[PDB]
Design a protein around this ligand. Structure first.
Ligand SMILES: Nc1ncnc2c1ncn2[C@@H]1O[C@H](COP(=O)(O)O)[C@@H](O)[C@H]1O
Ligand SMILES: [Mn+2]
Length: 336
């Protein structure tokens, strides 16, 4: 959701050597615009990277040349770009190119009204199993808002403390117990156990079904399956494996705090259910701009010889979380 939102032109700074364009700051994003398209304070529809914008030469002539066939529809995937050393992310169009939003307000999500959908990398061949049912409605999914979209929330949380973990580039995976049922899920579906299903294999490998059966509580262990043939196997692992990053308390419909999650992992491991965790870095006391957070995102991954996709920050009360994706990672890996 909110691929296209009405946002406010922030600081507008010139681009040396290029006089037809200039650099516009939209929340935490930097977005290249045609010169004089906006002034600071102007409103416009901002389209985030990963938006897919169906072909339309009169509304989106600036995307005419990057049109591709994507799930049977012709349009443009909005990706990170660096053109003359200037980072550029997203599309920012003045409001008067959208006469049907004339009465909308700043901050409105105009995604459906504009027909924007989301581009996604092809999901891994062996992570597409047999579906057993919907993703359980009593378990939260694992979406993380971007630090770029959280400027006022980054300031209100000044002084709060955050668990910092490495963001692993795999697939979201959930293993849960609710009363007399234990299932294994992908990002969007609960799956059937088969000999080839990867999620089920990684859950049997670390005995985490037996772990939830030992703990006797309604919990969802949420983590990332990574490894061979999963999103290009950044970490160069052999085989595939699950790395926990969250535990959802189903009965209380809230996530466990980081210390609760580490205590629960401790008791699992200690009882012979060794479930690995995404790498944990130093707790961070928040006193930063989004630019500063974004600058932290680059670094070593689980495999400390590769550059990580980014970092995830989870407040110590478990009630506020976000991710910061490394823009170097986005400029190196075009399928992200
Ligand atoms: N350390 C982490 N904490 C939270 N989520 C993570 C972590 N590492 C990887 N992820 C994945 O990153 C996703 C965040 O959104 P996305 O940018 O759509 O991949 C989550 O849904 C998880 O699948
Ligand atoms: Mn991901």
């Amino acid at each position: 959701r909110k691929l296209a939102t009405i946002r406010t032109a922030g600081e507008i700074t010139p681009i040396a050597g290029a006089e037809a364009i200039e650099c516009c700051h939209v929340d935490g994003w930097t977005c290249v615009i045609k010169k004089g398209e906006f002034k600071q304070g102007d409103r416009g529809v901002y389209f985030e990277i990963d938006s897919f914008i169906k072909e339309d030469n009169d509304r989106y002539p600036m995307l005419s040349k990057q049109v591709i066939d994507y799930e049977g529809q012709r349009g443009t995937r909005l990706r990170t770009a660096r053109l003359r050393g200037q980072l550029s992310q997203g599309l920012f169009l003045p409001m008067d190119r959208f006469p049907e939003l004339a009465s909308n307000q700043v901050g409105d999500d105009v995604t459906e009204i504009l027909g924007i959908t989301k581009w996604e990398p092809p999901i891994s061949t062996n992570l597409s199993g047999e579906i057993l049912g919907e993703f359980p409605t009593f378990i939260s999914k694992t979406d993380q808002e971007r630090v770029q979209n959280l400027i006022p929330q980054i300031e209100e949380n000044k002084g709060q403390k955050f668990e910092v973990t490495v963001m692993l580039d795999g697939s979201s995976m959930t293993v849960y117990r609710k009363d007399d049922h234990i299932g294994v899920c992908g990002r969007n579906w609960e799956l059937r156990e088969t000999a080839t299903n990867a999620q089920w294999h990684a859950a049997r490998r670390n005995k985490m079904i037996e772990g939830l059966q030992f703990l006797n509580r309604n919990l969802a262990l949420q983590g990332e399956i990574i490894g061979e043939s999963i999103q290009g196997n950044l970490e160069k692992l052999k085989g595939q494996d699950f790395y926990l990053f969250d535990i959802y308390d189903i009965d209380k419909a809230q996530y466990l705090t980081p210390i609760e999650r580490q205590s629960l992992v401790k008791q699992l491991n200690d009882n012979g259910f060794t479930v690995k965790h995404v790498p944990i870095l130093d707790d961070l006391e928040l006193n930063h701009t989004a630019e500063q957070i974004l600058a932290m995102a680059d670094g070593p991954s689980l495999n400390k010889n590769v550059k990580r996709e980014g970092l995830v920050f989870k407040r110590l009360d478990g009630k506020f979380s976000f991710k910061a994706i490394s823009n170097a990672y986005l400029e190196k890996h075009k399928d992200r």
